[PDB]
Symmetry: D2
Subunit: 260 residues, 4 copies
Amino acid sequence: TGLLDGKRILVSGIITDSSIAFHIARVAQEQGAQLVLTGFDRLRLIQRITDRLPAKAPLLELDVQNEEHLASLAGRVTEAIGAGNKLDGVVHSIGFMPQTGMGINPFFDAPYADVSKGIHISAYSYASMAKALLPIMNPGGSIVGMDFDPSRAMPAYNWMTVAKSALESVNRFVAREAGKYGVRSNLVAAGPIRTGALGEEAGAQIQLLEEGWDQRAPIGWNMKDATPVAKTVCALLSDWLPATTGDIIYADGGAHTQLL
Amino acid sequence: GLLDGKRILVSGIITDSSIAFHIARVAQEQGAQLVLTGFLIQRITDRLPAKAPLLELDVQNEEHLASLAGRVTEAIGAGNKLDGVVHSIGFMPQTGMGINPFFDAPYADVSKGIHISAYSYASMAKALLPIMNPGGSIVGMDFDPSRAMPAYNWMTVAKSALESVNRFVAREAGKYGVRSNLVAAGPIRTLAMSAIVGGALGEEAGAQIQLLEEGWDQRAPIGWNMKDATPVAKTVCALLSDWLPATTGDIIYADGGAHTQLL
Amino acid sequence: TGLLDGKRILVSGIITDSSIAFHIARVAQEQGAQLVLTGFDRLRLIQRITDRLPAKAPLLELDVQNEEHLASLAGRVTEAIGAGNKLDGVVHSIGFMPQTGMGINPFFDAPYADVSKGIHISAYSYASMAKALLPIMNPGGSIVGMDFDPSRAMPAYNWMTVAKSALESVNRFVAREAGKYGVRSNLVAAGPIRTGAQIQLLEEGWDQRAPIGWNMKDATPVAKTVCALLSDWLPATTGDIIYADGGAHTQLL
Amino acid sequence: TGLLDGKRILVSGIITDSSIAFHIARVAQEQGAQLVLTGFDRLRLIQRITDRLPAKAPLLELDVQNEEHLASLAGRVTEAIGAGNKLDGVVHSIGFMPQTGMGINPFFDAPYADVSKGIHISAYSYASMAKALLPIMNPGGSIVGMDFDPSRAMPAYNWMTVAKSALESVNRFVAREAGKYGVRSNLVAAGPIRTLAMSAIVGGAGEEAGAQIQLLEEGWDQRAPIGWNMKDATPVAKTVCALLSDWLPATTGDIIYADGGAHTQLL
Ligand SMILES: NC(=O)c1ccc[n+]([C@@H]2O[C@H](COP(=O)([O-])OP(=O)(O)OC[C@H]3O[C@@H](n4cnc5c(N)ncnc54)[C@H](O)[C@@H]3O)[C@@H](O)[C@H]2O)c1
Ligand SMILES: NC(=O)c1ccc[n+]([C@@H]2O[C@H](COP(=O)([O-])OP(=O)(O)OC[C@H]3O[C@@H](n4cnc5c(N)ncnc54)[C@H](O)[C@@H]3O)[C@@H](O)[C@H]2O)c1
Ligand SMILES: NC(=O)c1ccc[n+]([C@@H]2O[C@H](COP(=O)([O-])OP(=O)(O)OC[C@H]3O[C@@H](n4cnc5c(N)ncnc54)[C@H](O)[C@@H]3O)[C@@H](O)[C@H]2O)c1
Ligand SMILES: NC(=O)c1ccc[n+]([C@@H]2O[C@H](COP(=O)([O-])OP(=O)(O)OC[C@H]3O[C@@H](n4cnc5c(N)ncnc54)[C@H](O)[C@@H]3O)[C@@H](O)[C@H]2O)c1
Ligand SMILES: CNC(=O)CN1CCN(C(=O)C[C@H]2CC[C@@H](NC(=O)Cc3sc4ccccc4c3C)CC2)[C@@H](Cc2ccccc2)C1=O
Ligand SMILES: CNC(=O)CN1CCN(C(=O)C[C@H]2CC[C@@H](NC(=O)Cc3sc4ccccc4c3C)CC2)[C@@H](Cc2ccccc2)C1=O
């Protein structure tokens, strides 16, 4: 008997087998969930990756910047799961920020066109996905999105931090709408996951930043392992956190609760 | 079950309306083997679906705390350890919460309230961590004290202290591969809460506590049922399980999402 | 002998005499500051409003969505204050969110083009203004922006709440850059000020929660708070938020 | 023509000229405030220290654990400032946690009697002082207490962190009461300042606690976008005076961070 036995769950965001969404999908299938997967742009490449999951699952195209894909999504999901069936879970594991808004580029040098594209994909799309899928979600259902704690500024993350701050606010509003359907909406704020290319300076800054989690975390933090993050997402998709919504669960080894 | 084969200590049962009674019931339904602590309680624990040894524990008693691990080992058998610990203990004299002005609470009463409600979370962890397995979990009960509110007064201060204690307990528990977290629940109609709504503290506090309570279901996007402790007991069992393995020194809100909404 | 004696301060965001920026400008002039004002679109109309201030101040055009206005801003400010002089303070009091993402319109019905415009003007522009003006700011200087506490969701504010959450994050990054110039960056989170039914109930719960009360018709306590941050009296506060809300955010009920 | 011209302000917590309260008192006097000072236990020693301030000020005894000192406080202050006059400001700059509740001693080994004494002095006393002084405070008045950000756990501060978490909660309740008098109540969360206790902890008086607190200080100046000078209490004293002034009239039950902005940055 699995944690998600009989649940129908949509999982977005698989691009490689290192994607957090790949591990979420794997754990959900191990726990008896029946999945529907969504992918962006390189669909034939994504299918070769989803072939590595323990079970078969239909793969649907979804570019969150495409209004036609969003308008047809519910109909395409209904065709995949069968008429009369609805989703119990939705996973948003999508993020993007051009190199001008994240990395080595000065914070002030990111043009708004790049920042806006990043915010569209990383934050606004959480509301777009909920709008498209809530009409085909069962009561007791659960929408989960991926977050990286943006309460404090940090080197390199720059405008992606701003996109996460916007995402946390979007999640609180999505919870108000999802509540009308008896559906929960929450984010999982993960520690860094290893999903010299940017030089010596940024490479060192990012290494110190990332090594700080394992030192601060009372139970440690393994950047090579997405499984504890995938398990946390599955806990929110389950019936075991039924009174949590518009909220953030931290799967970061407890690093955010410690100063040093 | 979610907790199949897990050995879990549950404190805080006094009546069958206690949040700890519901936590214990759900944990047994989910396959856990329990050890109960109390400080008349055996007649209540007889109502649980399965038998469980009941040990005496007054958290203000240093002798009870010093002997606790040995008494638990005797109950579960030599060579066996605990996988979970539940702290569901709270107390504040009437001088520190209710109708009494905030400034009129003498320190002796506030201190006793803080000892039982906050310091004892560290005391319980100190006594039980030496007999806990790696991957283990310690969970305590909280009521969001980030903002002041009518009547809760010094109990709000005790919860603010408890949240801080939890972050330090996580540092110690980490050495054993054990997590420590609090569940911040919405209001639940336990014995005291039903008496206050019933008018035991008068018309003024009765009305203030009723507005405090009604605003909760209004703010919660999924609603809030103060008569039902099951969503809170399920949340505690989620933290006792292997499904939140990277969460520690933290707070999970089982409040219908009320704390995320202004209006 | 005022709080801001001799300080050169830029103030954006005046449109009417009920604008929070109008009250900030008035209090700053009363406290001895020499101002430079910026306005958007209706400059002749804005000019007539700024004549109501106690002292004369040059008015410059600034549409924060206009890259040419931003590129020329420092030069235009230098012409207004004189060569060799720099700013000690910058006030960002700008916000906008198209009707689809604010009010009665469902949260899900706001198209991204409207949300993006709102975020550009309300949040990204705080970084744009700091980028343009930090090269003409003196050490010990202060950048202040206006915020409305977005830590919890609420009725009607909808996508403007999302823009404020983005603004708070932008402020923390602007502080990292401003620090290089010995300049502070902070936001003032104000209670509601008079500048449908749900907006009235939301706005009114504020005076109820506030331990010192809240007067939505009076912008002076907010203007005084902004001037406190522009002064030399909060020299160790940056990337932060000061709440001028009657203490409403500290109380549940 | 000072920021606090004509204001009558009570300042507690002076023990040495390194005390944050000494710098608060100095800046307040430079800004035209008329002070009343309170001292604990070593009053002859405290009088020699307060002699170093730019202006004379009456020194009153106040042990916050002493109910008789608290009951007589308002009358003693009234006698010092003159009948018919009231206070405009109150500064709480008091803290203590017995040795077992800090540094080298394991967090689990601090007995409750020590923790309770520490909480009494460091948190409950903020309510005690407000209870005693609000009846002799003018509208527009301000109560300010000193805090050290306890939102996250950290090495060595141990039970003193717990006392600060309790203090932040007490401040929110004090604001509800102070509001009835038209009085504000707020805390200033300061960055680390090399006072006598701070220098001793870094000095190893355990080695491990000294090493961790050295790391805490280094990181603070690193994280702070405007930097942090632990040898300079003046920015902290200025922030307290800003709250005592008429320039933050709509802020109450709140926390102002005078920490160089370090709490707003991860790295
Ligand atoms: N990796 C970490 O350290 C970390 C930490 C915390 C949170 N997260 C978050 O987890 C999520 C997944 O990131 P990841 O680390 O697995 O990286 P990833 O590159 O594997 O996943 C990002 C996904 O976004 C998809 N995407 C981009 N543009 C899209 C569009 N227009 N339409 C639809 N999908 C689009 C990509 O195709 C990809 O599958 C993101 O939200 C990320 O911010 C990551
Ligand atoms: N609305 C609510 O009921 C509510 C909301 C959120 C959290 N909580 C928390 O949940 C926990 C349980 O409260 P409850 O509502 O079930 O009430 P309860 O009265 O049933 O439980 C409190 C328990 O504390 C025990 N206790 C008191 N002093 C003790 C001592 N010296 N030693 C050992 N145990 C002692 C009592 O015996 C009792 O079992 C508390 O921490 C409470 O603050 C309750
Ligand atoms: N009024 C309140 O209740 C309240 C509460 C908290 C914070 N605030 C904030 O204070 C600020 C000022 O708002 P207000 O209430 O004074 O209203 P306002 O309408 O008087 O001012 C908003 C200003 O933004 C300007 N603006 C719009 N588009 C612009 C553009 N492209 N370029 C430059 N400027 C542009 C407008 O011209 C106007 O001057 C905003 O950031 C607002 O969110 C207001
Ligand atoms: N030093 C720092 O790094 C730092 C940082 C942030 C906040 N603070 C806070 O500032 C405040 C002042 O501390 P400090 O660093 O200036 O140290 P300090 O030792 O100079 O001041 C502490 C004061 O508390 C007094 N006190 C102790 N027990 C008392 C009692 N029973 N009754 C009355 N007064 C009593 C002492 O006499 C002393 O004057 C404390 O609340 C402290 O926690 C200090
Ligand atoms: C058709 N409208 C237009 O042509 C342009 N226009 C003008 C006003 N407008 C704005 O963007 C105004 C702008 C909002 C942000 C900022 N003001 C605030 O932050 C103050 C608010 S507005 C609001 C609304 C609901 C709840 C709280 C608050 C609070 C605290 C500056 C002024 C928007 C949204 C709008 C539409 C109709 C009625 C009211 C608003 C807009 O579309
Ligand atoms: C032998 N000493 C005694 O009997 C009495 N005594 C005096 C000083 N004492 C206090 O409680 C001093 C008090 C602490 C709280 C407060 N100071 C601070 O909060 C400043 C600190 S101390 C510290 C330690 C670690 C991390 C941060 C900080 C910060 C920010 C006022 C002064 C304690 C603990 C102590 C002992 C020796 C050296 C240093 C401390 C104490 O036991």
